[PDB]
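Technical annex B. To support the medicinal chemistry partners, we prepared a structural model of the target in complex with alpha-D-mannopyranose, based solely on the information shown next.
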Amino acid sequence: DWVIPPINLPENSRGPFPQELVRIRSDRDKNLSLRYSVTGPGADQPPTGIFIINPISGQLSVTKPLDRELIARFHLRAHAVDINGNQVENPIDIVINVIDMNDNRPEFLHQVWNGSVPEGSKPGTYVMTVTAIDADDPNALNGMLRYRILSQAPSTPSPNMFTINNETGDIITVAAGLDREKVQQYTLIIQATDMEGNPTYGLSNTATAVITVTDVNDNPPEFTAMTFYGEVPENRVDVIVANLTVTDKDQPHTPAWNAAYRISGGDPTGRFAILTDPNSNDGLVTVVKPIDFETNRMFVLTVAAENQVPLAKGIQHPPQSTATVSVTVIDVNENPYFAPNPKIIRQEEGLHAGTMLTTLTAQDPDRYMQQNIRYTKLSDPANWLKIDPVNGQITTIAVLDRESPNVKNNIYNATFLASDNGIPPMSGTGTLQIYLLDINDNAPQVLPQEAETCETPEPNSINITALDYDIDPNAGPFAFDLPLSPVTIKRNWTINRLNGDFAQLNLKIKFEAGIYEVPIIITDSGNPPKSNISILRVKVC
Amino acid sequence: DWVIPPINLPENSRGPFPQELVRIRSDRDKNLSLRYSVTGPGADQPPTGIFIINPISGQLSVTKPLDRELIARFHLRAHAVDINGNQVENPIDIVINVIDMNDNRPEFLHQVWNGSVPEGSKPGTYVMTVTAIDADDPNALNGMLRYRILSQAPSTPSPNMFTINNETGDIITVAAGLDREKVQQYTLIIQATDMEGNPTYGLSNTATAVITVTDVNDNPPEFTAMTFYGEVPENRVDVIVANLTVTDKDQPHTPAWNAAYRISGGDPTGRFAILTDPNSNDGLVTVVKPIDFETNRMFVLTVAAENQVPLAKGIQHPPQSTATVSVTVIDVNENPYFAPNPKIIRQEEGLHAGTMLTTLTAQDPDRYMQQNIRYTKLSDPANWLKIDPVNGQITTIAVLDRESPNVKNNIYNATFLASDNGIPPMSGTGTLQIYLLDINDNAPQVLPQEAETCETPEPNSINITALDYDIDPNAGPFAFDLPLSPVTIKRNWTINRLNGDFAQLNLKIKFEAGIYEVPIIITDSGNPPKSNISILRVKVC
Ligand SMILES: *[C@@H]1O[C@H](CO)[C@@H](O[C@@H]2O[C@H](CO)[C@@H](O)[C@H](O)[C@H]2NC(C)=O)[C@H](O)[C@H]1NC(C)=O
Ligand SMILES: *[C@@H]1O[C@H](CO)[C@@H](O[C@@H]2O[C@H](CO)[C@@H](O)[C@H](O)[C@H]2NC(C)=O)[C@H](O)[C@H]1NC(C)=O
Ligand SMILES: *[C@H]1O[C@H](CO)[C@@H](O[C@@H]2O[C@H](CO)[C@@H](O)[C@H](O)[C@H]2NC(C)=O)[C@H](O)[C@H]1NC(C)=O
Ligand SMILES: *[C@H]1O[C@H](CO)[C@@H](O[C@@H]2O[C@H](CO)[C@@H](O)[C@H](O)[C@H]2NC(C)=O)[C@H](O)[C@H]1NC(C)=O
Ligand SMILES: *C1O[C@H](CO)[C@@H](O)[C@H](O)[C@H]1NC(C)=O
Ligand SMILES: *C1O[C@H](CO)[C@@H](O)[C@H](O)[C@H]1NC(C)=O
Ligand SMILES: *C1O[C@H](CO)[C@@H](O)[C@H](O)[C@H]1NC(C)=O
Ligand SMILES: *C1O[C@H](CO)[C@@H](O)[C@H](O)[C@H]1NC(C)=O
Ligand SMILES: *[C@H]1O[C@H](CO)[C@@H](O)[C@H](O)[C@H]1NC(C)=O
Ligand SMILES: *[C@H]1O[C@H](CO)[C@@H](O)[C@H](O)[C@H]1NC(C)=O
Ligand SMILES: *C1O[C@H](CO)[C@@H](O)[C@H](O)[C@@H]1O
Ligand SMILES: *C1O[C@H](CO)[C@@H](O)[C@H](O)[C@@H]1O
Ligand SMILES: *[C@@H]1O[C@H](CO)[C@@H](O)[C@H](O)[C@@H]1O
Ligand SMILES: *[C@@H]1O[C@H](CO)[C@@H](O)[C@H](O)[C@@H]1O
Ligand SMILES: *[C@@H]1O[C@H](CO)[C@@H](O)[C@H](O)[C@@H]1O
Ligand SMILES: *[C@@H]1O[C@H](CO)[C@@H](O)[C@H](O)[C@@H]1O
Ligand SMILES: *[C@@H]1O[C@H](CO)[C@@H](O)[C@H](O)[C@@H]1O
Ligand SMILES: *[C@@H]1O[C@H](CO)[C@@H](O)[C@H](O)[C@@H]1O
Ligand SMILES: *[C@H]1O[C@H](CO)[C@@H](O)[C@H](O)[C@@H]1O
Ligand SMILES: *[C@H]1O[C@H](CO)[C@@H](O)[C@H](O)[C@@H]1O
Ligand SMILES: *[C@H]1O[C@H](CO)[C@@H](O)[C@H](O)[C@@H]1O
Ligand SMILES: *[C@H]1O[C@H](CO)[C@@H](O)[C@H](O)[C@@H]1O
Ligand SMILES: *[C@H]1O[C@H](CO)[C@@H](O)[C@H](O)[C@@H]1O
Ligand SMILES: *[C@H]1O[C@H](CO)[C@@H](O)[C@H](O)[C@@H]1O
Ligand SMILES: *[C@H]1O[C@H](CO)[C@@H](O)[C@H](O)[C@@H]1O
Ligand SMILES: *[C@H]1O[C@H](CO)[C@@H](O)[C@H](O)[C@@H]1O
Ligand SMILES: *[C@H]1O[C@H](CO)[C@@H](O)[C@H](O)[C@@H]1O
Ligand SMILES: *[C@H]1O[C@H](CO)[C@@H](O)[C@H](O)[C@@H]1O
Ligand SMILES: [Ca+2]
Ligand SMILES: [Ca+2]
Ligand SMILES: [Ca+2]
Ligand SMILES: [Ca+2]
Ligand SMILES: [Ca+2]
Ligand SMILES: [Ca+2]
Ligand SMILES: [Ca+2]
Ligand SMILES: [Ca+2]
Ligand SMILES: [Ca+2]
Ligand SMILES: [Ca+2]
Ligand SMILES: [Ca+2]
Ligand SMILES: [Ca+2]
Ligand SMILES: [Ca+2]
Ligand SMILES: [Ca+2]
Ligand SMILES: [Ca+2]
Ligand SMILES: [Ca+2]
Ligand SMILES: [Ca+2]
Ligand SMILES: [Ca+2]
Ligand SMILES: [Ca+2]
Ligand SMILES: [Ca+2]
Ligand SMILES: [Ca+2]
Ligand SMILES: [Ca+2]
Ligand SMILES: [Ca+2]
Ligand SMILES: [Ca+2]
């Protein structure tokens, strides 16, 4: 089957309507009287009445102008019937192609397009892409789009910072001088022209591209002053010294604005540490390890600034990226102390009142503030000791008796104070412990002081020992003897050695009631040996 | 079978070519690979290559612009064959109608059109018709013509003598004053404009109509002079009298210029007749019947002019259509004549010499020229007659003898002349015949004059009769007698009567030779009777 040629109509016809197009008829009309009719969308189905057919002549016609963007192709079919109702021809397909006209301006999806580009990017850097669409036929000139830029705001540093690939709509940069710290955002008017951007024939329409310039690290941190000043006490470990104040021209609170300090020198021992204040962007220098004034009176330290992210290629590191802090140190008053802590001195027991035993040395760390050393009495339960403020020498007040309940253990303990005449007065407690050697200076006594027995000439009635306040050898074996005079006593009594320390006494008369006081000479070892005539009270019946 | 719609193309397309029109294809191409081709005049037959078909797509195209006036409709048919040579569709008819454009100016058959109109025809009179043709479609505006007049030469009496029925092209008159004797021919520029004579859109073209104004009888014949003069002799019958000279302002030698004269009066007797000179248009007056001067000395005749065809409606008959001719008549000398022609007069015979017999009357027609009448001798063989010039009276010269060989018959004939003393002298011959009565004036004689016989006394020897020169009764019976003396004769002889006219003589003596003269008296009747003695000579032996 040969196919009835399609009818090719341009849209937006001016008419006048009903505009006639074509005449379909059946050759069977040589003898039959036929009636024609079209069916289908555009004819009898919606949209109704666009295409009509003269029932007699078979002439086809359009009644209004067409619109390709509304309907592009109509599919009518044509009918043939004689006046007696017989179908004379099978319905036949007939096509109307509506041919495109350029009656649609290009349109942009958005009316505002957002894009961003980094600072000082090489000319040729892609930024963003803006595209329009055309409701007309893409396959025809009518729907083929070209792009260009109409205006840039603002016009600095160059009027034409950007361009646009007139087909793809890629906005690419063509100048240099994209500096956030000067012009932080550009607004562009993009224009779309169809008909392949033909100036006289093309229909045009615009949009906006807003390009924001994103920050980079191209400004170094710069200290507000060349030199800073701070103060620190001795022996402190968590105190702020100074606040280092900087300016960075980049974007606040970006890594490229955040400061990164380190102490380049002036503290070879690590007394200070540095941390960046998150909010204020300051160099907080803090004493991390304690300092000694008498080793260091002043600190002079250099400190270098930087950012968290590296600086840009061609930018200079200025002198103003380095400042110097002078740390003046405040000196404090401190405790005095002593060469030995518990000054040990050996000394014999019996000694004069007024003998200089030993001197007590005491010194002070404060080498730059010279002071009065105040030696004073503290705690000696015996009061045998004297000391003067200027000298610190120790002299005896009394005789030093080691067999005393004031010297419980073999040595005597004594405390002393050394005080500062400084505004905050300090003091240190010194000890003196002295070893007292036992000399034989105690006369032996008789132990059974009140030994009393009746008149029995018993072979061993009374046994006597010695009381001595001295330790070996100043006690040892004791000699027991009766005196020669009065003559009566050795005539009444007799003494016998047992071993060393124990001796017996017994009456050698044969025979009353009362008191008999019997003198006894007792001597102990330690030379020169001391004797004593301790009297024994005896009661006999 | 549904019929592929015809393709409707305007002629004179601007292209660009090859301009595509329609796409025919077979739906059988769903699986077959087809090849298309057109055939027919305009395709493969002459004219070749106007319409081509893309063998693959089936697209049809024109290659040059069309011309409706050259070919109006193309009848191509389209073919379909698969790549393996099979005919897939029966060839199908396809029609290109070339639609008309107005690209032809109207054309006139002739470039010069001839027509004629009579003088002073009523406004509305049809003259001629001029028509153009248009090579474009008559059924369309393009070939629909309108007419108008662009110019008239000359512009008098009115600029716009004619108009033209803008559709039929009939040139009809609209003014008055069509006067041949002023403007004899008009030239018209006719213009044809197509597009129904549309001034801005129509294409125009011209021709010429030359209108000649045909003559009518609207000018009367007018005599050059009020009066004319001529001269005529007496008794003439084919002589020209005068040439009547006229002017007619109409067209020479047309019936409306030809003169027609008649004599309205002045000649109640029909002496003159008038004929028109074919060439000179003159009134030739000719003497058709002879005239007599003595009855008419002068003629005064009025003569009316006219044309062969009647004069036009409103025109006046002038006085100058009537002239008057004075015919002066020249008088001629004419013959004189006589009251009686052969003047008969009775007269007795014997009459004196000098007797006035009768007078001869003679008269003359010339009543206005009085003349001398000249009576003269002519022919009389006897000379008995005399006549004098002044009187005309006749008197006798001699004695009038009727018995003469000069008057053979009973009467005497005599001729006479009467002559004119005029410059051309005329004359008339008069006759006079006179009856002469016989009187007895002749003496009788003897008839046998020489009767001679011998001497015999014979009873009847000599018989004698009479000789008389007169007729009865002046002869009649004659008496015969012998004289008394001499005495001897009646003694010798004797006379005897026989009857009347015859008598006998005889000698009565008894007895020689010689001559005997015998006298005899003889008398005749007519009174007074005359006798005579006639002698008879006788010889006897
Ligand atoms: C879009 O860009 C194209 C490619 O740069 C342009 O096409 C060129 O235009 C120049 C005119 O100066 C011609 O000399 C060249 O022949 C073109 N190059 C080719 C082969 O593509 C075009 O001008 C631009 N469109 C507009 C009007 O902006
Ligand atoms: C030819 O003649 C016709 C008939 O006279 C003209 O047609 C008329 O034109 C006048 C314009 O003055 C109109 O008002 C009338 O309506 C017309 N009459 C009709 C009904 O035919 C015509 O103008 C002439 N053509 C030209 C242009 O010369
Ligand atoms: C001062 O002298 C010494 C200081 O060492 C004291 O003697 C010590 O006493 C303690 C009792 O708790 C014993 O256990 C130690 O053996 C002793 N020290 C040594 C190692 O000798 C003494 O008590 C102090 N004061 C007195 C009362 O003398
Ligand atoms: C003159 O007289 C008469 C004129 O009539 C002549 O007589 C006639 O002569 C002819 C001869 O030819 C006769 O026949 C006639 O009878 C005569 N006339 C009549 C009627 O009488 C005559 O001849 C003339 N002349 C002479 C010689 O006399
Ligand atoms: C850019 O962001 C702004 C909001 O400030 C908005 O108006 C716009 O739609 C954004 N651009 C697009 C289309 O992504
Ligand atoms: C210095 O540091 C202290 C504690 O961080 C703060 O009180 C003070 O405001 C700082 N100086 C400035 C101006 O940042
Ligand atoms: C009119 O006659 C002239 C000759 O004088 C001639 O040129 C012309 O053809 C005639 N007109 C027509 C077409 O009859
Ligand atoms: C008068 O008529 C005579 C004869 O026809 C001729 O010779 C003469 O020329 C005429 N006159 C004129 C001027 O026609
Ligand atoms: C010794 O004994 C005698 C007993 O007669 C006594 O008198 C004397 O006082 C005694 N002496 C002493 C004190 O032993
Ligand atoms: C008569 O007769 C005689 C004869 O004798 C003669 O003498 C005479 O002369 C005659 N007369 C005549 C003349 O007759
Ligand atoms: C983009 O931006 C602004 C507002 O949307 C306009 O000035 C411009 O015409 C375009 O729409
Ligand atoms: C009719 O008459 C003459 C010569 O033919 C031209 O003047 C005029 O244009 C028209 O042809
Ligand atoms: C394109 O932009 C231009 C300039 O702002 C306007 O004229 C138009 O309305 C469209 O937004
Ligand atoms: C720190 O700044 C001081 C200025 O007082 C310099 O003397 C030193 O060299 C360092 O740069
Ligand atoms: C001496 O030392 C004592 C400790 O026994 C302290 O309490 C006193 O303050 C002084 O420094
Ligand atoms: C029609 O007549 C006009 C005027 O004579 C001319 O212009 C033209 O040539 C044609 O003959
Ligand atoms: C002929 O012409 C004459 C003029 O001489 C008139 O007298 C006469 O009446 C007639 O018209
Ligand atoms: C007399 O008549 C005669 C005729 O007999 C003429 O011949 C002559 O001229 C005259 O008129
Ligand atoms: C034009 O095309 C670009 C492709 O990148 C998109 O931005 C968007 O889809 C627009 O229609
Ligand atoms: C302090 O240190 C900085 C390092 O950034 C240098 O740029 C400057 O010259 C000074 O020595
Ligand atoms: C801090 O102080 C020290 C010494 O006084 C120097 O390094 C510097 O001049 C600053 O003033
Ligand atoms: C020494 O003396 C000072 C006061 O001067 C005290 O603060 C310290 O405890 C010690 O006894
Ligand atoms: C000397 O040392 C002793 C301890 O050995 C303390 O008890 C005294 O206070 C002083 O400092
Ligand atoms: C136009 O038509 C008229 C009809 O009278 C004719 O003169 C001639 O045939 C011309 O073509
Ligand atoms: C002569 O006769 C003519 C006749 O045409 C008259 O018109 C004129 O008045 C005169 O009588
Ligand atoms: C001819 O002559 C006669 C009379 O002489 C008149 O009728 C007229 O005057 C004309 O001159
Ligand atoms: C009368 O006389 C004339 C001459 O005067 C002749 O011409 C004529 O014939 C006749 O004899
Ligand atoms: C008289 O008449 C006769 C004829 O009767 C002529 O012969 C003669 O000439 C005259 O005229
Ligand atoms: Ca549209
Ligand atoms: Ca469109
Ligand atoms: Ca478009
Ligand atoms: Ca920058
Ligand atoms: Ca920075
Ligand atoms: Ca920056
Ligand atoms: Ca210290
Ligand atoms: Ca200190
Ligand atoms: Ca101190
Ligand atoms: Ca002691
Ligand atoms: Ca001791
Ligand atoms: Ca001891
Ligand atoms: Ca043409
Ligand atoms: Ca045409
Ligand atoms: Ca035309
Ligand atoms: Ca006229
Ligand atoms: Ca005339
Ligand atoms: Ca005329
Ligand atoms: Ca006459
Ligand atoms: Ca005369
Ligand atoms: Ca005369
Ligand atoms: Ca006589
Ligand atoms: Ca006689
Ligand atoms: Ca006689």
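Notes passed to the chemistry partners:
The CA atoms of residues 397 and 433 of chain B lie 17 Å apart.
Chain B touches chain A at residues 1-6, 22-28, 78, 80, 89, 92 (CB under 8 Å).
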